[PDB]
Amino acid sequence: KWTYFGPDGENSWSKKYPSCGGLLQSPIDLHSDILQYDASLTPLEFQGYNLSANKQFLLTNNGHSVKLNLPSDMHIQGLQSRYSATQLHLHWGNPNDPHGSEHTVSGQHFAAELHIVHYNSDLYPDASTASNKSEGLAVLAVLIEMGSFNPSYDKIFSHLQHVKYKGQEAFVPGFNIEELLPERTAEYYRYRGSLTTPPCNPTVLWTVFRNPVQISQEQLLALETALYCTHMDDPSPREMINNFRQVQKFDERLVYTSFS
Amino acid sequence: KWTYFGPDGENSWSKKYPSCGGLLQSPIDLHSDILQYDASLTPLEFQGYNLSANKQFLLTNNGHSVKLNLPSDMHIQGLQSRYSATQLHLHWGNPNDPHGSEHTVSGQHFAAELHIVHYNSDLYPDASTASNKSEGLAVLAVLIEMGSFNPSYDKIFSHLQHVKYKGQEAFVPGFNIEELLPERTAEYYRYRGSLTTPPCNPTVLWTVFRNPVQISQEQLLALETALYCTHMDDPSPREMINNFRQVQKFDERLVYTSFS
Ligand SMILES: CCCCNC(=O)c1cc(S(N)(=O)=O)c(Cl)cc1NC1CCCCC1
Ligand SMILES: CCCCNC(=O)c1cc(S(N)(=O)=O)c(Cl)cc1NC1CCCCC1
Ligand SMILES: [Zn+2]
Ligand SMILES: [Zn+2]
Numbered sequence: 001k002w003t004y005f006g007p008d009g010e011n012s013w014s015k016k017y018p019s020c021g022g023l024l025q026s027p028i029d030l031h032s033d034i035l036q037y038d039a040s041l042t043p044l045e046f047q048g049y050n051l052s053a054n055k056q057f058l059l060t061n062n063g064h065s066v067k068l069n070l071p072s073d074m075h076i077q078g079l080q081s082r083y084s085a086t087q088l089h090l091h092w093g094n095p096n097d098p099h100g101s102e103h104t105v106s107g108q109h110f111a112a113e114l115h116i117v118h119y120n121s122d123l124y125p126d127a128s129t130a131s132n133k134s135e136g137l138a139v140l141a142v143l144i145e146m147g148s149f150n151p152s153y154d155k156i157f158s159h160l161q162h163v164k165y166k167g168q169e170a171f172v173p174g175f176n177i178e179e180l181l182p183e184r185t186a187e188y189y190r191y192r193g194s195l196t197t198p199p200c201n202p203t204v205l206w207t208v209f210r211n212p213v214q215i216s217q218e219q220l221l222a223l224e225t226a227l228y229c230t231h232m233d234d235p236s237p238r239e240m241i242n243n244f245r246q247v248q249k250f251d252e253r254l255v256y257t258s259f260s
Numbered sequence: 261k262w263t264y265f266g267p268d269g270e271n272s273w274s275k276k277y278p279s280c281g282g283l284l285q286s287p288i289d290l291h292s293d294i295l296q297y298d299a300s301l302t303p304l305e306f307q308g309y310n311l312s313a314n315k316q317f318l319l320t321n322n323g324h325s326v327k328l329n330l331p332s333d334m335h336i337q338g339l340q341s342r343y344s345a346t347q348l349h350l351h352w353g354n355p356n357d358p359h360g361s362e363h364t365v366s367g368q369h370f371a372a373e374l375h376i377v378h379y380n381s382d383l384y385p386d387a388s389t390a391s392n393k394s395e396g397l398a399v400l401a402v403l404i405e406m407g408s409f410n411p412s413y414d415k416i417f418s419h420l421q422h423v424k425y426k427g428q429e430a431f432v433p434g435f436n437i438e439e440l441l442p443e444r445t446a447e448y449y450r451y452r453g454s455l456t457t458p459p460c461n462p463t464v465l466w467t468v469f470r471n472p473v474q475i476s477q478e479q480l481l482a483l484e485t486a487l488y489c490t491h492m493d494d495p496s497p498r499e500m501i502n503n504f505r506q507v508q509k510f511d512e513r514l515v516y517t518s519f520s
Contacts, residue, residue, distance in 0.1 A: 005509070009509070011273070011281040011508075014271045014272045015275060015281075020271055021267060021272035025271070031359070033357040033359065034357060094511075096293065106368075107368050107369065109367070242509065247506060248271075249264070249265065249506065251265050251502060
């Protein structure tokens with residue numbers, strides 16, 4: 001059992017999950033001193049991101065986040081290996097402190113963060129097998145700030161009242177996942193890191209887009225208030241809030257940028 | 261054994277020091293969302309901070325920081341109990357990333373941080389005993405930024421070459437500790453927290469002064485390059501760099517300011 005609060009919280013994860021105290025942990029603060037321009041960081045191609053609108057995809061409350069299952073025909077091109085999609089999920093704060101992004105930029109939290117998880121389908125036969133192996137995973141990270149209402153994010157958020165409790169599921173019709181990505185996806189940070197949740201394996205190639213997307217105050221407040229980490233039958237509910245890991249030491253590592 | 265890097269680093273402190281996984285952990289990000297002005301917060305008075313020039317005070321490299329021993333007749337007035345000085349020490353980064361403060365303000369790391377550690381002498385016979393009782397310790401935190409040469413900090417920094425290795429000691433002649441303090445000390449952040457190092461006991465009343473001090477380019481670089489966490493007889497020396505804890509979660513709690 002692990003939480004983001006109290007005795008079972010992030011300072012104690014290493015007691016249950018060895019890699020959480022290991023090398024190459026994520027997330028990190030993106031700041032000037034550790035950035036290095038790299039011209040060989042070329043645009044990624046998002047292939048099969050336009051999901052079949054005639055297909056439905058499973059949304060689950062797994063007690064730590066809300067997760068959308070993705071099909072393996074969706075993938076990233078441009079990296080050395082092909083990486084096929086497995087799921088996306090989010091990280092957020094709470095109404096009294098709506099700064100719940102995992103990555104920070106010059107010490108500043110965004111409201112929230114989206115992760116699109118991909119596994120190395122050239123080297124490994126599935127995402128579970130890949131997760132603890134060399135070059136196993138690649139995540140796209142989208143930083144989210146309070147702003148304009150986002151119709152694309154609402155294709156997920158519109159279903160939150162039907163996954164309020166741990167283990168609840170809802171079907172989401174196919175839409176274009178590329179719509180969840182910000183402007184100028186050519187501009188990104190790249191570094192070698194880890195899962196930000198147990199088991200914290202140091203197997204992730206990270207791509208954090210430079211530009212945030214916006215969702216509205218009300219979309220943000222829905223995300224922060226809809227979900228519980230407890231089961232529906234539990235008469236002592238706990239709210240699912242502040243499900244973000246604190247930033248990690250970045251000792252020796254640099255962050256490579258496609259922009260300058 | 262505990263360090264700030266690799267497998268005995270801060271994510272693993274809780275394995276041997278369970279309070280590092282516990283309540284009221286320090287340091288923290290000082291940001292608007294969790295600040296409350298509190299008009300009842302009056303200026304601290306610094307008593308016997310002018311140390312006798314005829315007396316010598318022990319500087320030690322304890323393998324984690326450089327520590328200056330202070331006398332119990334050095335004290336703070338204006339808390340609920342008398343807090344008597346026991347030691348001061350420093351936290352810092354590295355020449356490639358010169359941002360090594362423990363506390364951050366609106367996500368901004370300072371160059372370095374000084375802590376003047378006091379203990380509740382009205383209730384406890386000594387600092388060691390006070391250190392595991394609530395309101396047992398009070399710490400004064402000074403944020404440090406690069407700027408003009410600081411002759412007062414050089415009263416400490418001129419001795420670093422005699423305490424390069426763990427266990428090494430030197431004597432520093434008494435000087436006015438108050439000279440290490442910033443302008444308008446009446447402006448501070450105040451909150452209940454912990455030791456920022458093992459054993460992480462939740463027993464500190466924190467005062468972080470609002471205004472930083474400056475040390476020069478060359479002073480900060482001397483601090484960052486002078487010392488090793490290893491003993492002189494260790495064949496695998498380790499440079500004492502990045503000896504600061506990451507900021508902690510601060511959920512359902514407030515920092516009080518003495519300023520509006
Ligand atoms: C949904 C949030 C709760 C638990 N965390 C995850 O599911 C999770 C989070 C991340 S992240 N937060 O992007 O670093 C990564 Cl890379 C991978 C994860 N799972 C693996 C996905 C592939 C199969 C093995 C499980
Ligand atoms: C930095 C030096 C490495 C080892 N840690 C300490 O000496 C230390 C650091 C802090 S801190 N960084 O100010 O929170 C505090 Cl409050 C107390 C500490 N120790 C004593 C333990 C018992 C006697 C009284 C004090
Ligand atoms: Zn994630
Ligand atoms: Zn300290």
